[PDB]
Amino acid sequence: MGKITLYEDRGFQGRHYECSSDHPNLQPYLSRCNSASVDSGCWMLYEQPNYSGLQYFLRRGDYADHQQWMGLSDSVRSCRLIPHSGSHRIRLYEREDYRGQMIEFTEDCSCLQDRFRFNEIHSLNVLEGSWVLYELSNYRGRQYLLMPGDYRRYQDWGATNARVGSLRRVID
Numbered sequence: 001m002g003k004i005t006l007y008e009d010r011g012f013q014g015r016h017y018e019c020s021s022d023h024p025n026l027q028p029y030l031s032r033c034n035s036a037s038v039d040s041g042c043w044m045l046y047e048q049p050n051y052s053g054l055q056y057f058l059r060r061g062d063y064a065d066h067q068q069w070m071g072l073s074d075s076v077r078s079c080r081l082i083p084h085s086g087s088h089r090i091r092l093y094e095r096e097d098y099r100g101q102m103i104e105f106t107e108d109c110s111c112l113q114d115r116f117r118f119n120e121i122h123s124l125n126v127l128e129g130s131w132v133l134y135e136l137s138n139y140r141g142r143q144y145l146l147m148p149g150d151y152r153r154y155q156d157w158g159a160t161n162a163r164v165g166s167l168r169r170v171i172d
Ligand SMILES: *Sc1ccc([N+](=O)[O-])c(C(=O)O)c1
Pocket: 039, 040, 041, 042, 059, 060, 082, 084, 170, 171, 172
């Protein structure tokens, strides 16, 4: 299970809604989201309905404004409870379709290029667990939730480029 309370206004003010599960469409309920309290679960907030647009990873804790989840705006129109995983393993590849140099991680990586000297990651195999891939180092820029499965090209994880600077496990 999980539980998040979404507030329209900064600092946990305004109209609010308590969500226990995936909600593909917040628009009837919240016209904006400027703070959130995550009681439990790892959540992905989405700028757009039906889990599209900019994605923001949130874990347990309180966020007094949208900048605290790296939000570019107060637009939150869907949210997903990310399934718990008990282990994490990801392979990153230089080229598409699992070709070229590969590196395999089981831990968080704040600076990819420190370990794998490629600015671009063209395919990846998420063998175990859910991960968040970040465009920039130190968990900045655009975020992309990765669930277990095969990603033969960067389009498969919802990005418009292959730039990857950091990545983290979805874990408590
Ligand atoms: S990814 C994640 C975050 C928080 C929690 N939690 O317990 O609050 C879980 C979990 O319950 O597995 C997972």
